[PDB]
Amino acid sequence: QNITEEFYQSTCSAVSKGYLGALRTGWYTSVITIELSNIKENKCNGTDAKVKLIKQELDKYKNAVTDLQLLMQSTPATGSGSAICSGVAVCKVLHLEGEVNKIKSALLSTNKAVVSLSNGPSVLTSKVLDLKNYIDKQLLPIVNKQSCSIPNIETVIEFQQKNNRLLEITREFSVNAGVTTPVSTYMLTNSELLSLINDMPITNDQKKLMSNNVQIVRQQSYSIMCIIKEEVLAYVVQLPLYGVIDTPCWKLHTSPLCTTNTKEGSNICLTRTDRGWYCDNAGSVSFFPQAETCKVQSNRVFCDTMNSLTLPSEVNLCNVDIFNPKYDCKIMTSKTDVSSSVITSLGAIVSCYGKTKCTASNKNRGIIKTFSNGCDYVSNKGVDTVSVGNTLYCVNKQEGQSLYVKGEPIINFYDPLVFPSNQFDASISQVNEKINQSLAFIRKS
Amino acid sequence: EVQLVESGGGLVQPGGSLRLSCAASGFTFTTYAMHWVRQSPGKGLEWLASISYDGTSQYYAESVKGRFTVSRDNSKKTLLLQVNSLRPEDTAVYYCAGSPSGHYSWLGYFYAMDVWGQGTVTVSSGQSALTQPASVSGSPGQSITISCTGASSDVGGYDYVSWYQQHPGKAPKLLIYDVSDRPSGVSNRFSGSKSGNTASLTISGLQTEDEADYYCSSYTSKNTLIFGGGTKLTVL
Ligand SMILES: *[C@@H]1O[C@H](CO)[C@@H](O)[C@H](O)[C@H]1NC(C)=O
C-alpha cells in the first residue's frame, strides 16, 4: 500500500517501511541460437562498388565468425564464479558432441522449443536470427561465380541489416571475455524477452512483475557464450527468478550523532552502522550491504540474495531501542565531528556540528528553519531543498506520511573521556564492555 | 562398400500419397548430403531435391515443388521422400544419391553426386533444361567429344559442371566434378573442359566398356540442379 516513515531521534536514524519486495532466489537459463553459414567464398574478377561492398560485408561476417571461434577456444577467465555456474554448466553440456545436433533437430520447424538434455534439465532453446537461410539463398549464388555478378543495392542493404546484430553480439562477447551484463537488446530483443518471460514456469504475478519492469530484469540477468559448432552460434541467457514477491521491506538511513562542545577535543561521535535495505524473508531479515544489489522501482524493490546476510528479526528493534542487549546492535565511533546530510525516502536527516551553515530553503518561500548543532530530520511535506554548507541536497517529493518517534539522543549518555573513539566498527555489547573495562581502570587508580 | 538402397514402390494408384526412403551403410551419415533423382523409362534424368547434412536447409526443383517434401532422420540413418497427388506422368525409377561435402548447407557446395543406388519403381496406370547430342558414333582407338550446352545461369556463370556414366540398367557413376577434376577409380581417359557456355567431356582410346549413355549437370544460379538429355555412345 502506502509507504510511510519513522524517524528515531534516539538513534539518529530513519526507517522507510511499506515497500513491496521481490528478492532473487533462483536462475532460469535459456539457450538462444543463431543459425550461421559455413562458407568458402571464392575469388572472382570484381571491381564495381557493389561487388566490393558485398565482399567487405562478407569479410566482416567471416572475421566475426572466426573471432567468436577463438573466443571459445581461449575464454578461461570467469567474471563472477558465484553467479554464472548454472549457465556455465549448460555451456559445458553443449560442448559435448551430438548435443548441439540435438538442439539443432528440435528447433527445425519453430523458433522456440524445449529440449531435454542428457543431464536432465529441460531448457528452452530459441532461434532468434537466421543468417544461414539468407546467405545460402540470396548471397552465395551472386558472389561464387567465375566473375562476380553485379548485385543490386537492395541486397547490400538487407545484408548489412541482417549481419549487424551478429557483429554487435560478437563485439559484446569479445570485449567482456564471453560474459556480458546487462543483457542488451542485441543479445535479446524486447519481443523475445517478453515471450521468454511469458513462457517461464513462474506464477502469473511474477510474469506481470518481470514484464512491467523489464529493464530491471535485464539489469539482473547474464548472457554467457557457449560454442560455435556446425554452423550454429549458441549462448545461454540467465534470467532472475523472484521466488518471494510482494514481501515487506525496510530502509535504514544513518547519520553521525555528536556532542555540541566548542572544543573539537571534547566531542565524541557515534553513527549507527549497517545502513541499507532490510527485507522480510521466511520469518527472518535479509540485509543487503552493497548498494547495487537492490534496484528500486516505485513502491517495488528488486534485490539480489547472492551477496547478502541473514539476521534474526530482532535487529529491527535496534531502530527504537539501540541500548537493548536482546540484540547486539552494532555502531561505529570516532572523534570526527564533520557535518553531513542523508536524503531519506520521505525526508532528510541533517547532522550539523561546529562552524557549519545548515539550512532548508524552499523555491517559493525562503529558509523556514536554520538547523542548530545536533542531529535532526525533516519531512518532505512542504520542504523542497536542504542546504549544508556549500552543498545542496534535494528532498524526494513522493507523497506519504512521516511519524516523528521522539526520544533523547543517546550521545548524551556517554562520558567523552573514556569513550572508545578509535574502536571503529563495534557491537553495542562490545562498547558496554569497554566502558566496564574503563571503570575497572579507574577503581584501582 | 558405401552402399545406398532404395525402398517403397511397386504399383500404385494415380492419386493419394506415397512414401519412399533410403538406407545408409558404409559411411558416416552426418557428413553426407542427399539427393533424390528420377528417370522415366527410356528417357533422361531429372533432378528433384537435396537436403543439407543437418536437414535444416532443403531446396527443390521448380517442376516438383510443393507436391514433394524431403525429410531425414539422422538418428535412424535414413532419408525419406513423400509423394502427394501422384500423376500418370510420374511413373519412373527413383534413385537415391549422396554427395561427400559436410558441415555445409548451400546447394553449390554439394552439387555433384558420386554414390548411387539400385532404384525402386513407381508405376501408375489407368524435361531437360540442359541439352546434349544423342547420336555419337565412335570407332575404337579414336577420340570423340560430347557437348553439354547451357546459357550463363547454368555451366556458363559457374565453374560447376559434373559428368556421369550410366550403363543400360544400372546405377550412374561419377566421372568429372568441378570442371575438370575427377574422383578415384576413374580412368585417365576421362577428362572434361569448359569454354564459355558449353562444357565438353572428352574420351580417347575408346574401348568396349565405354558404349553407354552419359549425362551432365550444373548448378543453376536459381539454387537448383539441371540435368541434360543423355548421349548414346556406339563403339564399332
Ligand atoms: C557493567 O556493570 C554493570 C554493573 O552492575 C552491569 O549491570 C552491566 O551489565 C555490565 N555490563 C557489561 C557489558 O558487562
> Which residues of chain B are at the A interface, by a Cβ-Cβ cutoff of 8 Å?
30, 54-57, 74-75, 103-109, 157-159, 219, 221-223
| R_g of chain B computed on alpha carbons | 17
Give a yes or no: residue B128 inside a domain. Answer: no
DSSP class per residue in A7-25: EETTTTEEEEEEEEEEEE-
List the B17-21 sheet strands across, edge first. Answer: B17-21, B78-84, B68-73
Distance CA A418, CA A268 (A): 10
Three-state SS for B7?
strand
In a domain, B234, yes or no: no
Please count the structural domains in chain B. 2
Residue where a domain terminates, one of B63, B95, B123: B123
Q: Kindly give the distance from the C-alpha atom of residue A429 to the centroid of ligand 1, in angstroms, as a whole number.
A: 10
Asked whether residue B153 is domain-assigned, the answer is yes
Same domain, A221 and A174: yes
Give distance in angstroms: CA of A316 to centre of ligand 1: 24
CA pair distance B40, B42, nearest whole angstrom:
6
Distance CA A9, CA A137 (A): 74
What is each CA distance from A312 to A278, A325, A327, in whole angstroms?
Answer: 11, 14, 9
Sheet holding A391-394, edge to edge: A358-359, A385-388, A391-394
Cβ neighbours for B183, distance < 8 A, ≥ 6 positions apart: B114, B174, B177
Which neighbouring-strand residues pair with A265?
none
Instruction: Give the closest-approach CA distance of B206 to chain A in angstroms.
Output: 33
Residue A130: phi, psi to the nearest 5?
-125, 90
- At residue B136, φ and ψ (nearest 5 deg) are -145, 95
Q: Which residues of chain B neighbour A144 with C-beta distances below 8 Å?
A: 108, 158
Residues in chain B: 236
Cell of B203: 574420351
Tell whether A234 and A259 lie within a shared domain: no
Using DSSP bridges, classify how beta strands A300-304 and A13-24 pair: parallel, antiparallel or unpaired.
Answer: parallel
Whether B12 is covered by a domain: the verdict is: yes
Clarify whether residues A368 and A409 are in a common domain: yes
Q: Let me know: does A13 contact A254? Beta carbons within 8 Å.
A: yes
CA–CA gap between residue B37 and residue B162 (Å, rounded): 15
Give me the amino acid identity at A415: D
Cis peptide before A141 (omega within 30 of 0): no
Residues A89 and A187 placed together within one structural domain of the fold? yes
> Sign of dihedral through CA atoms B174, B180, B182, B187?
positive
In a domain, B235, yes or no: no
Q: How far apart are CA B58 and CA A302, in angstroms?
A: 47
Contact list, B103 vs chain A (CB under 8 Å): 38, 230-231
Looking at the fold, whether B9 and B67 belong to one and the same domain comes out as: yes
- Contacts of residue A353, Cβ cutoff 8 Å, sequence gap at least 6: A256, A258, A260, A267, A337, A338, A339, A373, A374
Helices A153-175/A49-73 angle, 10° precision: 20
B130 in a structural domain: no
Compute the distance between CA of residue A385 and CA of residue B116 in angstroms, rounded to an integer: 86
Q: Are residues A11 and A54 in the same domain?
A: no
| B176 in the same domain as B69 | no
Which strand (E) or helix (H) includes residue A72?
Answer: helix A49-73
Query: What is the nearest CA distance from A230 to chain B, expressed in angstroms?
Result: 6
CB atoms within 10 A of CB A320: 15
For residues B34 and B23, the answer to whether their CB atoms sit within 8 Å is no
8-state DSSP, A138 = I
Residue A181, domain extent? 29-240
Q: Kindly give, in sequence order, each residue whose CB lies less than 8 Å from that of residue B30, ignoring residues fewer than 6 positions away.
A: A101, B53, B74, B102
Q: Are residues A233 and A360 in the same domain?
A: no
Residue B206 has phi, psi (to 5 degrees) of -65, 140
Last residue of a domain, one of A186, A209, A240: A240
Q: Cβ distance A416 to A268 under 8 Å?
A: yes
Minimum-distance ligand 1 atom for the alpha carbon of A436: 1
Question: Pocket of ligand 1, candidates A415, A418, A432, A443: which has the most ligand atoms within 8 Å of its Cβ, to mutate?
Answer: A432
Same domain, B118 and B28: yes
Residues 13-52 of A with CB under 8 A from B: 35, 37-40
Task: Assess whether A236 and A250 both reside in one domain.
Answer: no
Print the domain residue range for B87. 3-123
CATH number of residue B74's parent domain: 2.60.40.10
Instruction: List, in sequence order, the alpha helices (H) in A253-380.
Output: none
Question: Do B56 and A132 lie within an 8 Å CB cutoff?
Answer: yes
Q: Based on the domain organization, do A156 and A179 belong to the same domain? A: yes
Of the candidates A280, A297, A394, A412, the one whose C-alpha atom is nearest the C-alpha of residue A348 is A394
Does residue A344 sit in the same domain as residue A236? no
Q: Which of A240, A257, A287 is the last residue in one of the domains?
A: A240
Same domain, B22 and B118: yes
CA distance A375 to A362: 21
Centroid of ligand 1 to alpha carbon of A433 (angstroms): 8
Tell me if A108 and B103 make a contact (CB, 8 A cut-off). no
On whether the CB atoms of residues A378 and A360 are closer than 8 A, the answer is: yes
CA distances from A309 to A16, A37, A221, A281 (A): 20, 49, 21, 11
B92-99 sheet: strands from edge to edge: B10-11, B120-123, B92-99, B33-39, B45-51, B58-60
In this structure, are residues A285 and A261 in contact, taking their beta carbons and an 8 Å threshold?
Answer: no
Residues B108, B184, single domain; the answer is no
What is the tally of structural domains in chain A?
2
Task: From chain A, pick out residues whose CB is under 8 angstroms from the CB of B74.
Answer: 101, 105
B34 within 8 A of B79, measured Cβ to Cβ: yes
My answer on whether A235 and A250 are in the same domain is no
SS3 B4: strand
- Answer yes or no: do B93 and B151 share one domain: no
- H or E, element range at B3: strand B3-4
CA separation for the pair A267, A13 (Å, rounded):
20
- Tracing cell 571459445 back to the chain, one arrives at A72
User: Cα–Cα distance between B62 and B84 in angstroms, integer?
Assistant: 15
Please indicate, yes or no, if residue B13 is contained in any of the structural domains.
Answer: yes
Residues of chain A found within 8 Å of residue B105, distances taken between Cβ atoms: 37-38, 132, 136, 231
Domain assignment present for B9 = yes
> Which three cell numbers, joined as nine digits, stand for A15?
526507517
Last residue in a domain, options A179, A210, A240: A240
Residue type, B195: S
According to the entry, how was the structure determined? X-ray
Q: Regarding beta strands A340-343 and A309-311, do their DSSP bridges make them parallel or antiparallel, or are they unpaired? A: unpaired
Nearest partner of A234 among A83, A101, A77, judged by Cα: A101
CA dist A68 and A170 (Å) reads 6
Nearest CA-CA partner of A34 in A142, A194, A192: A192
CA A324 / ligand 1 centre spacing (Å):
13
Residues B14, B118, single domain; the answer is yes
Q: Tell me: do B100 and B163 sit in the same domain.
A: no
Q: Tell me if B144 sits within 8 A of B203, measured CB to CB.
A: yes
Q: Do B55 and B110 form a contact (C-beta atoms < 8 A)?
A: no
Residues A84, A145, single domain; the answer is yes
Query: Do B161 and B194 belong to one domain?
Result: yes
CB A210 within 8 A of CB A197: yes
Residue with cell 519412373: B92
B108 and B207 belong to one structural domain: no
Q: What is the resolution of this structure in A?
A: 4.0
User: Which amino acid is it at A275?
Assistant: R
Between CA A267 and CA A277 the distance in angstroms is 30
Contact A17, A248 (CB under 8 A): yes
| Under 8 Å between Cβ of B14 and B126 | yes
Gyration radius (Cα) of chain A, Å: 30
Which is nearest to A331 in space by CA: A406, A251, A419, A266?
A419
E strand or H helix at A133? helix A131-134
